[model samples]
Target: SPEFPSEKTFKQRRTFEQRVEDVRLIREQHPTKIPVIIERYKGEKQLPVLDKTKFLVPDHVNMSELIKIIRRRLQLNANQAFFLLVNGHSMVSVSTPISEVYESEKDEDGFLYMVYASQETF
Candidate 1:
């Protein structure tokens, strides 16, 4: 069995220039939306891999709202575990607008990256 997901991380798969251009073009066309790339945490044991990796998030949407959107998209059960991390390290405030994080944590290519994982609370 393959030990990891079949595809490489977005940055690894695309050249820096390609990613930059992607963000540039997307931003130029959708100024009010933030370009986000969501991926499964490498160590996540229970969460299913997301089918769609790229998203155009409304700049005004908060992290909590975005989490709910991803949760719904994943079709997770009501009590299922879910948490999001930025740059695979920190959990951002649910009430903060996504754009706030993007300003500081965006990658060199200009896209914000987020990783989703589940922790067994019991």
Candidate 2:
């Protein structure tokens, strides 16, 4: 086996889970952009204009921030409010953990499933 990582070494052995944990650590010290697919609902024709939208956001970014990024990417007005539903009609929140949501809500298609809509007058 290779020499053990020591006080002088920066590299160390790690497992799959350990690596994932490290990724989270890296985000705390150095936030990297994580890309996700956004599905927005619109007309009956089911236009592709709002589907498969590729958005890059901070790894630990909250759902609220994610919405803003999505809105900017879609070129929507700043004051626009959108309703978002995660997998299986999940209601998203600002305190929602991305890792938790991604693992539980991400689909087999390798995309986080979410339905978005413009707010309606109440």
Candidate 3:
């Protein structure tokens, strides 16, 4: 369970240093160009709701570079979590170079919410 109604609770459960380090790592390894999917929670289901208008392919890098970014950001160490296909909606509201997809929400039991982010290359 989560300790709060927001994902920040999960982030807060970790030491400040750990959070900072994770953020630092993510920031440092940020990709220059890649298509990203944003997943938001609705009701009890965390399933992704696709936004057709927001779908886009990045121009700064080739498909290969995009693939690299996906692998790193997803933290997939092995083939276990790998899947045959991935589909999601794009975030059209933000114009920043980087888009923030899922966020953590803490439940009442001090458990952290798990949000997943990923990218795809052609």
Candidate 4:
């Protein structure tokens, strides 16, 4: 299992760089499950807390592949519209590095931030 620092443990040390490296090592060494939540609108019966999507990937390239997997699954549904947003913004490109995106968008918890959504742009 991963033995990465907890909040208190991280607090014991300073330097944002140090904390960042520690979190990076954990992802490199083990299965780092990044949450890919599908949001519901303002007034909708909450979608059941069921199967979720996560990535054990190393970078945005792999992330793109995973998105493709979801893309395929979604296509089988209805147009399978998807937008993998890191934080509140959008992915730069499938070629962009995951580290940059994570560092830029991750919450205070240090977990990679990604959101999946279904919408028709047409």
Candidate 5:
């Protein structure tokens, strides 16, 4: 007698229609672009700075706030893009110690010292 296939085997044999629908949904949800900022810490002992002209918050800002700003500046949907802040001088300089860090924004100058842009999908 032939043995019946297990539930796991059945799951692996999804119908072509099911596969197509799954692929379509994934494509629709894929991010078209991602916004990010690269910042360099300045001042003695990594002190934060303030600059009024930029109209940005001074002091370490939260990840959420940074995302909001990037979205508004880029004119993208709130959930459309991802935001990231990469910090560290270890690879650049051994004397500085490996202390890579990332945060939204705690101060205004934080926004000034970095490259702001989005990663295009196309």
Candidate 6:
């Protein structure tokens, strides 16, 4: 997959109503999956940007498991640091089920937004 795809973020490309409908259809057909949009933090310099920003995560998966999936996609070494901030603000507990996080953290458009970064401000 190509690294750092230069395209508009999903929320930017689609209107709120369109995105809400998209999520509604996805959930109606795949009730066990969580609609997630993951992107690299704009200020990130150390981590490679992901080719794909949208993810259909299984509802039973935990936050740490999803992080592992993203880490694998980035082909990161064990020494590299990474973390996800939900909707640009919250650090979800690692053991929380993805569905549980989605319930509380999903955006108004209905997709859960996560930004990945190599570091966080203290």
TM-scores, all models, native as reference: 0.88, 0.51, 0.25, 0.49, 0.27, 0.87
Candidate lDDT (C-alpha), each: 0.86, 0.53, 0.33, 0.48, 0.32, 0.86
How much does candidate 3 score in TM-score? 0.25
Question: Per-residue alpha-carbon lDDT of model 1 for 1-122, expressed as tens digits?
Answer: 58965657887888999999999999999999999999987677788889888999999998989998999999999888888888646464568898898897999899999888885222
Name the candidate that leads on TM-score.
1
Q: Per-residue lDDT for 1-122 in model 2, tens only?
A: 26863222111233446545554664466545543555654321222245234444556877776766566656766565666677545354566756556767754434454666664221
lDDT of 4 by residue, 1-122 (tens): 16874222223343567646655766667644442333322222322221443344545445567556556654434533455565555452465655555556665645564555443221
True-structure Cα RMSD, model 2: 14.9
* Candidate 6 clashes between residue pairs 3 or more apart in a chain or in different chains: none
Number of the top-ranking candidate, with lDDT as the measure = 6
Off by over 4 Å in 6: 1-7, 89-93
Worst 10 residues of 5 by lDDT: 89-98
Q: Against the hidden true structure, what lDDT does model 1 obtain?
A: 0.86
Model 4 scores a TM of: 0.49
Indicate the TM-score of model 6: 0.87
Predicted structure 1, TM vs. truth: 0.88
RMSD (Å) per prediction? 2.8, 14.9, 12.9, 10.0, 20.4, 3.9
Which residue runs of candidate 3 sit more than 4 Å off their true CA positions?
Answer: 8-64, 82-122
57-118: candidate 6 lDDT, tens digit per residue: 99999988888899999999999988889855546446899999999999988999999888
Error at 91, model 2, angstroms: 4.4
lDDT measured at residue 16 in model 1 versus the true structure, 0 to 100: 93
